[PDB]
Structure formats: C-alpha cells, structure tokens
C-alpha cells in the first residue's frame, strides 16, 4: 500500500532507455520528467505472478514493456494499487473488459487516454506487463478464453488485437502489470 517515487535524471541510462522508446512514436511531445515507481508489495505480487507464468509457458518471453495513458487524477491510485479492480481507467471495447496497454506510445498519448490536465500535462506509464501466451480478444471477455476446450483450466494470459502483429494487449488480473515508470509530458 506504501510506495516511493524517484525522479530519473536526464543523464541516467535508465532515463534514456525509457525516453528513447517513448520517442519512437512521440518525438513531437516534450518530456517534462520520468519517474520510477517503487511499490514493494505490488512489485512482489507481480514478481510472484511472473515466476508462476515463467514455470508454465516454456520458451515464451512472458513480459513486455508497454504503454498506458491515464488522467492525472488516476496517478495516485495506480501508484498505490497498480491497475486493479477499482481502477477507473479500465475499458470494455472490442477486445474485452480489462486494462489496455499499447505497444507504441502514440496510441496512449491520445488525449482520450492521457487527458491533458489544467496545466497541459499528460501522463503515460511504461509498464511491465505479463502478456504470456495471448490470442485475439473479443468484446465479451472479462477473463481470457481457455486455450484447450479439452482441458479448459489453463487460460490464455492476455488478449490482443492481432496475434501476429499486435498493437495492444488487454490484461485482466491484478498483479499482471507493474507501473514501473511514469512519463509526464506535454504537446
Ligand atoms: N490507455 C491506453 O494507453 C490504451 C492503450 C492501448 C489501447 C487503448 N485502447 C482502448 O482503450 C480501447 C480500444 C481500442 O484500442 O480499440 C488504450
């Protein structure tokens, strides 16, 4: 429930990694700051989920770093809780009801997701997400579908808009995502 926020200096390698990724598609924005969110209990629950996923998915690289735009007022909620059940920015559209994450930052930089606040600042997290093994989503999902109807325990881990060339992923569970970095920027 408790956490720390550490601002990255522009000259730190970590700053540059995050900024470079963001700027692949968001170079016309101006980055005001980049912070690392340190929430030990959330990190520990996320690592336990990764350890379980890594034990079951074979060679799959279960983790992706993806983007999530949100309004200024959701930042304290995400910082304490991650993208949990009460997170007001969960969405229910063509790929299911859950939390939506973008492969590319420009998608999250849309004003609909990273709403500019009264000072014009926009907020996009760069999030460790356990994408695991995924399939094509659909509007009815609140959890991902089962992989094999002949042994329906094991579900897909996430769903996506396009299995072989994804642009977004939907995660349905708490502790499937860790809000590692917060990028504050403007137009
Ligand atoms: N909030 C986000 O940054 C984000 C990331 C990826 C996708 C979306 N999209 C949606 O919330 C809804 C529908 C969709 O893309 O088709 C938002």
Swiss-Prot record:
Domain PARP catalytic: 1-187
Induction info: Up-regulated by IFNG in macrophages. Down-regulated by IL4 in macrophages.
Tissue-specific expression: Expressed in macrophages.
PTM comment, free text: Auto-ADP-ribosylated.
Localisation per UniProt entry: Nucleus; Cytoplasm
Subunit relationships: Interacts with STAT6. Interacts with PARP10. Interacts with PARP9 in IFNG-stimulated macrophages; the interaction prevents PARP14-mediated STAT1 and STAT6 ADP-riboslylation.
Family the entry assigns: Belongs to the ARTD/PARP family.
Function according to Swiss-Prot or TrEMBL: ADP-ribosyltransferase that mediates mono-ADP-ribosylation of glutamate residues on target proteins. In contrast to PARP1 and PARP2, it is not able to mediate poly-ADP-ribosylation. Has been shown to catalyze the mono-ADP-ribosylation of STAT1 at 'Glu-657' and 'Glu-705', thus decreasing STAT1 phosphorylation which negatively regulates pro-inflammatory cytokine production in macrophages in response to IFNG stimulation.
Protein's recorded name: Protein mono-ADP-ribosyltransferase PARP14
Origin species: Homo sapiens
Full-protein residues shown: 1615 to 1801 of 1801
């Amino acid at each position: 429930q408790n956490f720390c926020v550490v601002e990255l200096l522009p000259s730190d390698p970590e700053y540059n990694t995050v900024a470079s990724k963001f700027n692949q598609t968001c170079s016309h924005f101006r980055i005001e700051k980049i912070e690392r969110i340190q929430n030990p209990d959330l990190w520990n629950s996320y690592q336990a989920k990764k350890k379980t996923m890594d034990a079951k998915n074979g060679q799959t690289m279960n983790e992706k770093q993806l983007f999530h735009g949100t309004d200024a007022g959701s930042v304290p909620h995400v910082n304490r809780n991650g993208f949990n059940r009460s997170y007001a920015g969960k969405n229910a559209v063509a790929y299911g009801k859950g939390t939506y994450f973008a492969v590319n930052a420009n998608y999250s930089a849309n004003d609909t997701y990273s709403r500019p606040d009264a000072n014009g600042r926009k907020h996009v997290y760069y999030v460790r997400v356990l994408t695991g093994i995924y399939t094509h989503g659909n509007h009815s999902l609140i959890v991902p579908p089962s992989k094999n109807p002949q042994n329906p325990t094991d579900l897909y881990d996430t769903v996506t808009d396009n299995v072989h060339h994804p642009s977004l992923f939907v995660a349905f569970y708490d502790y499937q995502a860790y809000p590692e970095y917060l990028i504050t920027f403007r137009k």
